[PDB]
Amino acid sequence: HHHHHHMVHITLDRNTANSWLIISKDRRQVRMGDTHQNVSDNKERFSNYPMVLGAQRFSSGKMYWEVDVTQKEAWDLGVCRDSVQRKGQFSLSPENGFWTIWLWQDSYEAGTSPQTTLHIQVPPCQIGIFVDYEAGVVSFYNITDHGSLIYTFSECVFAGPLRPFFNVGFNYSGGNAAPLKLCPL
Ligand SMILES: CNC(=O)[C@@H]1CNCCO1
């Protein structure tokens, strides 16, 4: 893949974050706190899950960014509609406005409905995410394995502005405290 040249500088939007998340000063790293982070509630915040959105909104063009997932046991990554539900329980699916992959219990899966098994020989430490708005494509790349393709959602019906999407996962096990980090360009 030669998507690197569509690289965009993504920053996290504090106002969307679950109240337990801790976003770094530079707005490039997020991790699960061990408690409520002493913020007011608002209608933007994801209530049920440790999720946060990027600040950037995309309605055209080609966009690429990379996320570091080193030593995490669980996470969700991708893009979503700006108008996704924030409160209560929901599934990550294109019907609900999400184009995502995840790691969960030692398996990788794409957020289709129902979910699709991914085939990854080299556990990734960094994930590349490519969006082509006009083409209706979201693709995921294994940066650790020379940029090998993980998954392509095609014929996507975005139906609105897109935002980068993150879930750091719960840390019930004590083995999932590590942050998600936006990697430098
Ligand atoms: C349909 N399933 C989901 O939405 C979640 C996403 N997080 C990992 C487990 O599955």
From Swiss-Prot:
UniProt similarity note: Belongs to the TRIM/RBCC family.
Self-association state and partner proteins as the record states: Homotrimer. Component of a SCF(SKP2)-like complex containing CUL1, SKP1, TRIM21 and SKP2. Interacts with CALR, CUL1, FBXW11, HSPA5, IKBKB, IRF3, SKP1 and VCP. Interacts with SKP2; the interaction with SKP2 does not depend on an intact F-box domain. Interacts (via N-terminus and C-terminus) with DCP2 (via N-terminus and C-terminus). Interacts (via C-terminus) with IRF8 (via C-terminus). Interacts with ULK1, BECN1 and with ATG8 family members, including GABARAP, GABARAPL1, GABARAPL2 and MAP1LC3C/LC3C. Interacts with TRIM21 and SQSTM1/sequestosome 1. Interacts with IRF3.
Domain free text: The coiled-coil is necessary for the cytoplasmic localization.
Compartments, as annotated in UniProt: Cytoplasm; Cytoplasmic vesicle, Autophagosome; Nucleus; Cytoplasm, P-body
Domain B30.2/SPRY: 8-185
Function: E3 ubiquitin-protein ligase whose activity is dependent on E2 enzymes, UBE2D1, UBE2D2, UBE2E1 and UBE2E2. Forms a ubiquitin ligase complex in cooperation with the E2 UBE2D2 that is used not only for the ubiquitination of USP4 and IKBKB but also for its self-ubiquitination. Component of cullin-RING-based SCF (SKP1-CUL1-F-box protein) E3 ubiquitin-protein ligase complexes such as SCF(SKP2)-like complexes. A TRIM21-containing SCF(SKP2)-like complex is shown to mediate ubiquitination of CDKN1B ('Thr-187' phosphorylated-form), thereby promoting its degradation by the proteasome.
Protein name in UniProt: E3 ubiquitin-protein ligase TRIM21
